[PDB]
Amino acid sequence: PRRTPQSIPYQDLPHLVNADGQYLFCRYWAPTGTPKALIFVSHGAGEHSGRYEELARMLMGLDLLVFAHDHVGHGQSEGERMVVSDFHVFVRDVLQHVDSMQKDYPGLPVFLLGHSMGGAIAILTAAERPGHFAGMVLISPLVLANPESATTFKVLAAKVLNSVLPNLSSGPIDSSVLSRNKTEVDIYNSDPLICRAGLKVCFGIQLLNAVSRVERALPKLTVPFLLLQGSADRLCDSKGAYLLMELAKSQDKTLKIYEGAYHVLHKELPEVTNSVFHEINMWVSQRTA
Numbered sequence: 001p002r003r004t005p006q007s008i009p010y011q012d013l014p015h016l017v018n019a020d021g022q023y024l025f026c027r028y029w030a031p032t033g034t035p036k037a038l039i040f041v042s043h044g045a046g047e048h049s050g051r052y053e054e055l056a057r058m059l060m061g062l063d064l065l066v067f068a069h070d071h072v073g074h075g076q077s078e079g080e081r082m083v084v085s086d087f088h089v090f091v092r093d094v095l096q097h098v099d100s101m102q103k104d105y106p107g108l109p110v111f112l113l114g115h116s117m118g119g120a121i122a123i124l125t126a127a128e129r130p131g132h133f134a135g136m137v138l139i140s141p142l143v144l145a146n147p148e149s150a151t152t153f154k155v156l157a158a159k160v161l162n163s164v165l166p167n168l169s170s171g172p173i174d175s176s177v178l179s180r181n182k183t184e185v186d187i188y189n190s191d192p193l194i195c196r197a198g199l200k201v202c203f204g205i206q207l208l209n210a211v212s213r214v215e216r217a218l219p220k221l222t223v224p225f226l227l228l229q230g231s232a233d234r235l236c237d238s239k240g241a242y243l244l245m246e247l248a249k250s251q252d253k254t255l256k257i258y259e260g261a262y263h264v265l266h267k268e269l270p271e272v273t274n275s276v277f278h279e280i281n282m283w284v285s286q287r288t289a
């Protein structure tokens with residue numbers, strides 16, 4: 001029988017088979033009553049859906065049915081770790097899961113929540129289905145990568161794109177730039193389901209594709225969104241958040257800047273994280289009443 005990369009049979013776990021025949025591990029948090037809306041949680045590179053337990057439980061407490069899967073190559077889903085044939089695979093698979101849930105739960109509004117790479121996936125998902133999503137919550141979405149990281153990575157990308165170098169990777173990122181909360185950093189460094197290895201160059205190329213595709217999608221984006229961004233973000237440059245606010249056509253767009261905060265706002269210092277949870281709670285509550 002088919003098993004996760006951690007040797008657990010998929011028959012023992014919630015799952016979905018994607019269009020490429022790959023098993024995706026799924027998570028669900030459903031309220032005891034009739035849901036007011038559905039919301040898909042889109043995780044970022046290297047991590048997995050289990051990192052969203054507390055946010056998901058908050059949203060479920062608002063009577064939303066929260067659902068997620070581990071993207072291909074991540075967590076408990078299948079696929080060579082941190083490989084993707086094309087970035088759109090992630091978007092396609094989100095859409096499959098959304099479409100499946102909308103059948104089981106017809107007539108409900110559907111929201112997207114995405115962090116980091118998962119925020120770029122959310123943007124591209126909404127841009128593919130204009131008018132279909134009720135709203136998007138973006139936590140430091142990948143709109144522009146760190147300019148310094150992008151420049152040096154593009155040099156590595158040149159080698160892989162001009163030669164046959166299938167194993168080339170970037171150096172690992174220093175986990176301390178992910179959050180000022182050292183306990184959250186230590187937890188991230190301890191989770192066996194998180195891939196903390198240096199980025200394979202082929203995957204980083206797909207992140208460059210994500211950035212290019214987000215740029216082209218902005219003038220089409222009309223979905224309501226809440227955008228949360230730290231001013232000291234070394235992964236997704238804050239300039240991308242300002243550009244998203246300026247270039248999206250959405251009539252309902254709000255930006256909250258957390259001064260001094262690092263990339264992972266929902267795992268930051270308690271004052272930041274508590275505010276992040278409260279702001280998402282209010283924004284979703286106002287749009288599901």
Ligand SMILES: O=C(c1ccc2nc(-c3cnccc3C3CCCC3)oc2c1)N1CC2(CC(n3cnc(C4CC4)n3)C2)C1
Nearest residue numbers: 044045116117145149150153178179184188204207264267
């Ligand atoms: O999605 C991403 C992402 C986004 C942009 C990236 N950029 C590179 C990158 C790296 N090295 C060389 C180059 C690059 C880029 C330069 C140009 C293109 C590639 O890696 C990225 C990853 N995540 C980080 C990520 C935050 C997750 N988290 C969950 N908890 C925690 C801790 C606080 C508790 N952290 C892990 C989710």
